[PDB]
Write a protein that binds this ligand. Structure first.
Ligand SMILES: CC(C)(O)c1cc2nn([C@H]3CC[C@H](CO)CC3)cc2cc1NC(=O)c1cccc(C(F)(F)F)n1
Ligand SMILES: [Cl-]
Length: 297
């Protein structure tokens, strides 16, 4: 209730038949992941994002349908300025679509890579984005949800670079947040996942680890995994710095002119604490929030 039920044919119309050319070149395609492709549309003068779900990795039709249903359930329960907003969906015929308010600055991942020639994010803007993302995760944890896929591709940016958490298809309710459960279907993005999540545990503490990797992407402007890089995994720079083979200053994004040592070391210190290999030693999201607020004094 509150979401609009669209026919598939209407969404076909407003995306120019899911036009696959990039938006940068006059098409409708904005991005994609393991569970679908996101297209730009216009519905009744409103710019929208339309995610058409697909098995882009190996996933059953039934699992896809459960992710669709979970997205709608979380978005029905959770409204917050640091979460994306669902307008509607379509489930008639074979295809599943979710329709959202459009995010004019795309994904934090794309902005950190300056995809399509966008200017590099200032350190000032990076600090505000880290704070907003932590406020969104805090709202989810306060509402007894575990996200399970926190990463820079799932943190979107509006016209004022307000951070919005997206993609609740893998989210799980936690019984009063305290109690860890096991699953036999291990999901998430390997380069972001806590060790316990890679073993099948489900706990909000795994969201904190993944957020640590996002903070390193913000500091460095490097992707979480790059097969043509040493180290391949960004989280391994933590070990390089701990074993004084390197310093955070060796990894700071060069595409900024406003990064002071003090606030960069403060953000690195939050990231380092989030990336504790032992889940019980990680700060909770409320502490992460406080540390990121103290960082900008
Ligand atoms: C798909 C992707 C990566 O997220 C996305 C990429 C974009 N690129 N741009 C360009 C950025 C560069 C600028 C040049 O100045 C012009 C526009 C706008 C975008 C908008 C996007 N997403 C959404 O609007 C959106 C909203 C809610 C829920 C979701 C969902 F869950 F489906 F991912 N997506
Ligand atoms: Cl996985």
């Amino acid at each position: 209730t509150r979401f609009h039920s669209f026919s598939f044919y209407e969404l076909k119309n407003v995306t120019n038949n899911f036009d696959e050319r990039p938006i940068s070149v006059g098409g409708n395609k904005m991005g994609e992941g393991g569970f679908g492709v996101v297209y730009k549309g216009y519905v009744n003068n409103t710019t929208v994002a339309v995610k058409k779900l697909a098995a882009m990795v190996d996933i059953t039709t039934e699992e896809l349908k459960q992710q669709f249903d979970q997205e709608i359930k979380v978005m029905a329960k959770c409204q917050h300025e640091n979460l994306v907003e669902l307008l509607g969906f379509s489930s008639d015929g074979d295809d599943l679509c979710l329709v959202y308010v459009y995010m004019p600055n795309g994904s934090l991942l794309d902005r950190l890579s300056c995809l399509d020639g966008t200017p590099p994010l200032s350190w000032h803007m990076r600090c505000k984005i880290a704070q907003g993302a932590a406020n969104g995760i805090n709202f989810l944890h306060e509402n007894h949800h575990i996200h399970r896929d926190i990463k820079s591709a799932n943190i979107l940016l509006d016209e004022a670079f307000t951070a919005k958490i997206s993609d609740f298809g893998l989210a799980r309710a936690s019984e009063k947040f305290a109690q860890t459960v096991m699953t036999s279907r291990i999901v998430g993005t390997t380069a972001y996942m806590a060790p316990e999540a890679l073993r099948g545990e489900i706990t909000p503490k795994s969201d904190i680890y993944s957020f640590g990797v996002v903070l390193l992407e913000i500091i460095t402007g490097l992707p979480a995994v790059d097969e043509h890089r040493e180290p391949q995994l960004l989280l391994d720079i933590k070990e390089e710095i701990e074993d004084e083979e390197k310093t955070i200053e060796d990894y700071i994004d060069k595409k900024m002119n406003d990064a002071d040592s003090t606030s960069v070391e403060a953000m690195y210190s939050v990231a380092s604490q989030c990336l504790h290999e032992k889940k019980n030693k990680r700060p909770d999201i409320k502490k992460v929030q406080q540390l990121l607020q103290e960082m900008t004094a």
